[PDB]
Amino acid sequence: PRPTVIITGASSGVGLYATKALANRGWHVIMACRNLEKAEQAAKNLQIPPEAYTILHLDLSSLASVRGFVESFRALNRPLRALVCNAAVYYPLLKEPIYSVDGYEITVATNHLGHFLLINLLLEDLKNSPESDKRLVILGTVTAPDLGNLEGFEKGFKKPIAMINGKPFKSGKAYKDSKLCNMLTARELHRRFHESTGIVFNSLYPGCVADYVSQELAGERVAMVVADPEFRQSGVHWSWKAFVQELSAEASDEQKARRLWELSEKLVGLA
Ligand SMILES: NC(=O)c1ccc[n+]([C@@H]2O[C@H](COP(=O)([O-])OP(=O)(O)OC[C@H]3O[C@@H](n4cnc5c(N)ncnc54)[C@H](OP(=O)(O)O)[C@@H]3O)[C@@H](O)[C@H]2O)c1
């Protein structure tokens, strides 16, 4: 019946090669992508058997699209074994911010807020699934950049607010802030839900993937964290030969992780 894993941002890079690696291991991969034609071209391009994947539309920068993707996935009537939050956007050259359809600065909106809504919905599916070895894996970063007292979120994160700490827009820092949000979400997931659900919640940094380690190897590392018994440990950040990486003070701040969660629920319409 083939275990089922959802991978966001599966049409390129780490996510595409993770799709390849898990399809090779006998999994059925849901490629959750925003450009359906680029995704089908990429899967064919890597010679992934069509039995092993299903492409569904997901645009993380639109909260309505997130809910639409979840609807489409649930219509397949496939029990979920794992979720990989891999998609990310980075805009190195912007000097002024870009806002999502929902009104949110696009880097944080895509990399954190859209994933945050997706996680909260698909947690329901992981809980209900009868699989015994269920995992939610978040792609993190090397930096283990600062959210202040989350003033930008406390005020609702609408234009002209463009940074989580409410200070002036900086595009490179917006990216790092968004990856710190990913790390804090992985930590709060473990704290709140690991004992209650038995789901393994962790993160990983696969290495520096110019395009240094290859995209193919990075994808294989994602597959190990998803599938291999040696990585069945909740609440840890894996880094590379793999080791448990101690996190920064800000990423280990449990009050901040909880407050980020509460404010994020509000911003995505879950409160
Ligand atoms: N590259 C590195 O060295 C490195 C290092 C550490 C961590 N990471 C992390 O690894 C993960 C993947 O990175 P990558 O290097 O493989 O980058 P990538 O090749 O540019 O792939 C990013 C994927 O995310 C998707 N994406 C962007 N916006 C989206 C949206 N609104 N909705 C749905 N999907 C969206 C992209 O879709 P499109 O194909 O349509 O553009 C693309 O498939 C990220 O979380 C990144 O932070 C990367």
What domains are there in the chain, each with its CATH number?
A: 4-268 (3.40.50.720)
Residues 186 and 251 sit within 8 Å (Cβ to Cβ): no
Q: Measuring from atom 19 of ligand 1, which residue has the nearest CA? A: 13
Question: 200: closest CA among 83, 100, 87?
Answer: 83
Nearest CA to ligand 1 atom 1: 209
Residues pairing with 244 in the sheet: 238
Gaps in the chain (C to N over 2.5 angstroms) fall after 144, 211, 240
Is the CB of residue 13 below 6 angstroms from any atom belonging to ligand 1?
Answer: yes
- As a whole number of angstroms, the distance between CA 164 and CA 166 comes to 5
Q: How far apart are CA 48 and CA 20, in angstroms?
A: 6
Residue nearest to atom 6 of ligand 1 (CA): 141
Please choose, from the candidates 174, 157, 161, the residue with its C-alpha nearest in 3D space to the C-alpha of residue 266. Answer: 157
99 assigned to active site: no
Residue with tokens 């002036």: 168
Q: Using a 6 Å cutoff on CB, does residue 121 contact ligand 1? A: no
Judge residue 93's burial from the number of C-beta atoms within 10 Å of its C-beta, 0-12 exposed, 13-18 middle, 19 or more buried.
Answer: exposed
Q: How far apart are CA 107 and CA 172, in angstroms?
A: 10
Exactly one of 17, 53, 104, 175 is catalytic; which is it? 175
Task: Round to whole Å and give the CA distance between 27 and 49.
Answer: 11
How many angstroms separate the CA atoms of 156 and 175, rounded? 19
**Closest-lying ligand 1 atom to the alpha carbon of residue 142:** 6
Amino acid at 32: A
- Binding site annotation covers 60? yes
As a whole number of angstroms, the distance between CA 207 and CA 163 comes to 27
Resolution (A): 1.9
Q: Which helix (H) or strand (E) holds 239?
A: strand 237-239
Q: Which residue has the tokens 């911010």?
A: 97
Indicate the DSSP class of residue 204.
Answer: E
Residue closest to 106 by CA, chosen among 169, 193, 45, 53: 169
Q: Are the C-beta atoms of residues 30 and 69 closer than 8 Å to each other?
A: no
The answer to whether 12 is a known ligand-binding residue is: yes
| 91 has binding-site annotation | no
**What is the amino acid identity at position 265?**
E
In this structure, which residue's CA is closest to atom 14 in ligand 1? Answer: 13
Within 10 Å of residue 131's Cβ, how many Cβ atoms? 14
181 touches 112 (CB < 8 A): yes
According to DSSP, the β-strands at 200-205 and 237-239 are: parallel
Cis status, amide bond into 79, omega within 30 of 0: no
Q: Which residues contact 160 (CB under 8 A, 6 or more apart)?
A: none
Contacts of residues 69-72 at CB distance under 8 Å and 24 or more positions apart, as own/partner, are 69/32, 69/118, 70/118, 70/121, 70/122
CA 267 – CA 113 distance, rounded (Å): 8
- Tell me how far CA of residue 143 lies from CA of 4, 22, 181, 212, 254, in angstroms: 31, 27, 12, 16, 18
Q: Is the CB of 60 under 6 A from ligand 1?
A: yes
Q: What distance in Å separates the CA atoms of residue 9 and residue 100, rounded to the nearest whole number?
A: 17
